[PDB]
Amino acid sequence: SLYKGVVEEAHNVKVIGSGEATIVLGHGFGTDQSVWKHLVPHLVDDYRVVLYDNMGAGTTNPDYFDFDRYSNLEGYSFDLIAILEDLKIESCIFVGHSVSAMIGVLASLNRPDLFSKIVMISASPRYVNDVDYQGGFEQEDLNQLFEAIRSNYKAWCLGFAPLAVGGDMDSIAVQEFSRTLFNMRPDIALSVGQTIFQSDMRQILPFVTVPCHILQSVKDLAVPVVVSEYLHANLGCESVVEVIPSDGHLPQLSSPDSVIPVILRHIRNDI
């Protein structure tokens, strides 16, 4: 089949660890499964861990990027479901970073039986400000971002990576994220950037039935703190919010000492 060439090969699927329960880790825009490097060592002894890359990431084949399939987030949610079915995983804890949080939400709406919980990191149901909604961006801000990608992809990557990652502009996390951003095919980065930035998942939040743990940095370029409160209030499922005293959109990569313990508590404990 209902959701789908090897699925495991196309998504660079890696299955590691051992245990009764399975954790599936979904990464955000501009990075890949390497974003979970500091988390994975704390999971492998207790859980089976599934890592995969989103179609369109620089580590994936650009010839497999189906513009119709990925014209909405549902295309990524069907790839996630196909990965779970391919592996015969009947239930998982899903940890979704950035766009993967909404991808996970959508997959749980299509298949709630496959998810016991969703742990979101840097999630947002809508980036653009609306009448009674603070997303953090005006349409003009996105228009400037897309113009910069059209004009000079390399310069945009170098200017955007320290802003998205936060903290020290010469850190290893900034260098890793500039590298994975620049590994994307520029036209795919622009197409995906537009699909994500123009998404609006608000209407479906009350229909979510899988419990959600909402985690984010207090200072995140793409996610005002208010978005975490908006998610908690509007998700129809049982949810909990934890705002971390950290800076950055990829905090599990840039501040692991303070961020990893928080992610671990939400994975290991139920609401």
Rounded to the nearest 5 degrees, what angle is found at the Cα of 23, between the Cα atoms of 69 and 33?
A: 55
Contact 48, 19 (CB under 8 A): yes
State yes or no: is 79 an active-site residue. Answer: no
What 3-state DSSP class applies to 80?
helix
What 3-state DSSP class applies to 8?
helix
Catalytic residue among 32, 53, 79, 220: 220
What single letter denotes the amino acid at residue 226?
V
Resolution of this PDB entry, in A? 1.9
Distances (CA, A) of 104 to 1, 80, 97, 191, 227: 20, 8, 9, 20, 17
Tokens of 194: 């537009």
Method: X-ray
Give the separation between CA 55 and CA 188, rounded to whole angstroms: 10
* DSSP letter (8 states) at residue 150: H
Catalytic residue among 98, 199, 246, 254: 98
Catalytic residue among 77, 249, 255, 266: 249
The yes/no answer on whether domain 1-271 falls in CATH 3.40.50.2300 is no
To which H or E segment does residue 7 belong? helix 7-10
Other residues' Cβ atoms within 10 Å of the Cβ of residue 169 = 11
Surface-to-core class of residue 202, CB atoms within 10 Å of its CB (0-12 exposed, 13-18 middle, 19+ buried): middle
Contact 255, 246 (CB under 8 A): yes
State yes or no: is 249 an active-site residue. Answer: yes
State yes or no: is 141 an active-site residue. Answer: no
Contact 23, 92 (CB under 8 A): yes
The strand pairing partners of 51, in sequence order, are 14, 25
Give the separation between CA 64 and CA 43, rounded to whole angstroms: 31
Other residues' Cβ atoms within 10 Å of the Cβ of residue 74 = 15
The strand pairing partners of 23, in sequence order, are 49, 93
Surface-to-core class of residue 261, CB atoms within 10 Å of its CB (0-12 exposed, 13-18 middle, 19+ buried): exposed
Give the separation between CA 90 and CA 87, rounded to whole angstroms: 9
Tokens of 200: 């609006």
Give the separation between CA 211 and CA 78, rounded to whole angstroms: 20
The strand pairing partners of 92, in sequence order, are 115
Query: Considering only CA atoms, which of 29, 59, 27, 56 is closest in space to residue 40?
Result: 27
Other residues' Cβ atoms within 10 Å of the Cβ of residue 204 = 16
Sheet bearing 92-97, strands edge to edge: 14-17, 48-51, 22-26, 92-97, 115-121, 212-219, 239-247
What 3-state DSSP class applies to 129?
coil
Angle, to 10 degrees, between the axis of helix 99-110 and the axis of helix 74-87? 70
Give the separation between CA 166 and CA 164, rounded to whole angstroms: 6
